[PDB]
Ligand binder design. Sequence first.
Ligand SMILES: *[C@@H]1O[C@H](CO)[C@@H](O)[C@H](O)[C@H]1NC(C)=O
Ligand SMILES: *[C@@H]1O[C@H](CO)[C@@H](O)[C@H](O)[C@H]1NC(C)=O
Ligand SMILES: *[C@@H]1O[C@H](CO)[C@@H](O)[C@H](O)[C@H]1NC(C)=O
Ligand SMILES: *[C@@H]1O[C@H](CO)[C@@H](O)[C@H](O)[C@H]1NC(C)=O
Lengths: 593, 185, 12
Amino acid sequence: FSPQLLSLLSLKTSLSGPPSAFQDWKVPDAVWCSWSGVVCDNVTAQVISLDLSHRNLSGRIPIQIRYLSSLLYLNLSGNSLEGSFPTSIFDLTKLTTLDISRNSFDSSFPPGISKLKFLKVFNAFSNNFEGLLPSDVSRLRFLEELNFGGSYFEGEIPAAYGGLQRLKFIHLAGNVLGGKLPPRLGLLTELQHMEIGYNHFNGNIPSEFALLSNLKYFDVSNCSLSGSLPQELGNLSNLETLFLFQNGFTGEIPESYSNLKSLKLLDFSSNQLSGSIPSGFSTLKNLTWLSLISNNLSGEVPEGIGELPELTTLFLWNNNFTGVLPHKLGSNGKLETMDVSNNSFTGTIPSSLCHGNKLYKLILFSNMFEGELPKSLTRCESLWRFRSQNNRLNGTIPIGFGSLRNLTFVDLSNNRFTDQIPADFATAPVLQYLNLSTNFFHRKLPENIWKAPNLQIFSASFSNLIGEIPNYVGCKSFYRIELQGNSLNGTIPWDIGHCEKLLCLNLSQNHLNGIIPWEISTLPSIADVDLSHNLLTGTIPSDFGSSKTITTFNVSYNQLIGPIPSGSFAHLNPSFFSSNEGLCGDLVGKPCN
Amino acid sequence: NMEGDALHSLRANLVDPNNVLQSWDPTLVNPCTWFHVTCNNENSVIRVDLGNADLSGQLVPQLGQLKNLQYLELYSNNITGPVPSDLGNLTNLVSLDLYLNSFTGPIPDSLGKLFKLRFLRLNNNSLTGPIPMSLTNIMTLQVLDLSNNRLSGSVPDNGSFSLFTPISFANNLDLCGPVTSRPCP
Amino acid sequence: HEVPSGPNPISN
Ligand SMILES: *[C@@H]1O[C@H](CO)[C@@H](O)[C@H](O)[C@H]1NC(C)=O
Ligand SMILES: *[C@@H]1O[C@H](CO)[C@@H](O)[C@H](O)[C@H]1NC(C)=O
Ligand SMILES: *[C@@H]1O[C@H](CO)[C@@H](O)[C@H](O)[C@H]1NC(C)=O
Ligand SMILES: *[C@@H]1O[C@H](CO)[C@@H](O)[C@H](O)[C@H]1NC(C)=O
């Protein structure tokens, strides 16, 4: 029968795969053209397209190929098969398209590749290749898309490559490739997409790169490239993506960049960039993601960023920045996530951040922010993660937080917040973390407090608290509680044995009195307990020594009296019980009886 | 956030039918905002408390890379598999509680390398093999419970093991010693 | 071998 048939059959049998893969290929005249994955040219019966991928198919690739001569398409993807790449495939030659991606091929890349020549698309992405990039591929003039990434390719990027006039798309990303990026690259005029990152390059970005007009996607990230950001780059007017993040770039960000009006995503993160942000950055109305994270960046943030109709992700964190946040910020209503933390930012939080209720992650922390906390912020449905710690935020805390079905993480610690703690706080259904510590409150906890449906960590420590500690009513999810350093009086609740999951409880430096409830002897996982510096008087509970989980009990500086438990308590530190003048036992030194 | 990647390795190898690990988010700047993880003021992990999480499956040796890890509490779970010798790679570890699980295999001699160690509880597991002598070089050791296992061997009475009553080593396969009931060769 | 792609993710 036909060489097409000998070919397809030999291909069937030479590739070891689950029989599900080749299920329809058996032969009884032009039969093979029916088969699954096969497409034939309706006049000639010759197999012009072969797609077999994600077939879980491994093996050797037959030498009885090139028997289907007019074949324009070959796709084999994800199938794990390793080898030196077959040089046999280069002798196909009517191929316009070849995808060998996501497979295991290794060692070097065989030289004969230029023999294809009418070739448009080559995808080698995600394989085990080592060795220098084949220089040879540089000679297919018509090559449009080339993906060599996802391998380990040694050596530099052949400058020869700049000569594929028709090349649209180039992916060398995630290899071992190195050195200076060859300037000749600015000569692919038709070039749209360039992703070369995750290899190791040094030097600058070649000024000559400003010559690619049609360029859209440019990602050089996770390399060693350095020096200044070239002014000239401000001239690629078609550019929708620029990722320069994690490199050695220095000096100010050139004002010229205010010129990419098509720019959408910009990520400069983990560089040395210095000086202020271009006043002209206010002008990119196609801008969606803006990330300056972790640089030397300075000066105020341009007021003009207040309205970019499209702004979504804003990351300014880890610089030294100054002044107000742009005050109409968030009013574009599409704002999702903002992190400005670790800066010198001052002033008031924008009232309109959530004006569109699309915002979820808000990190304002470690800043100079002053003034009250936007009431509007309790109106944000989407709010899930919010961390405001280490600021000057003042006055009473806004009262609407318990509404939100999505809100799981809140840190208000170290601020100037005064007055009451919001009551609805423990009514909010998902809230898993709450830190109100180190504030100016001068009021007391809610009755609601221990009722929190899923709430694991809670810290009110060192904010000017006063009053009785509300009885724990169905303590559910709590593992860590810090109430220490306050003016709280009254007694430790009868029902505290309700928190089964409780681990570390720091109650110290307070005005507490009465006794220490036996119920704690029965907390099943309990680890750390710090009760020191109080008016507590009573006995240390009988059965406590029977617990395999307590490593810490600090009852020091109290009125306690009576014997200390022989138990786990034997392994304890004497200085835990010191300045309790009424205790007897071994660890206090004075015997009973 | 190296240790973040490590904790996440553990997570990934882990079966978490109730999603406690669900807060463990590899893309976070470090795992100090994770639940069940506790870090210091230097932002390195000193604690991992997963006790009673209904976790199944196993552990990865990546747990070694937490250099400042002090308390590792995995007790009362369905965790099975072996015990990684790379736990010897944890120096500042004060407490190791693996007890109440399905763990199999030897007790790693590398465990003899933890000199800040105070509490060691492997009890109520499936462990086999002998009791490594290097364990006796930890003089900070206070509570050792090896009880309820498959352990074969002879029990050390020297070093820290001076202080240990039989309730520590009770109910095993052949185990011989003066720390126990039945002597040996 | 698979390779990262996109904007830098790291977060707080
Ligand atoms: C090859 O096939 C895979 C799956 O069939 C597909 O996802 C991929 O886009 C194809 N490659 C090309 C460029 O034809
Ligand atoms: C902005 O993006 C939209 C959608 O891609 C497009 O219609 C428009 O051409 C772009 N405008 C600019 C400034 O290039
Ligand atoms: C520990 O082991 C024994 C023997 O297998 C078992 O019967 C006992 O109940 C176990 N202890 C616990 C904590 O369940
Ligand atoms: C005795 O204990 C020491 C630890 O002090 C240990 O190094 C040694 O190997 C043990 N063996 C004997 C029989 O001395």
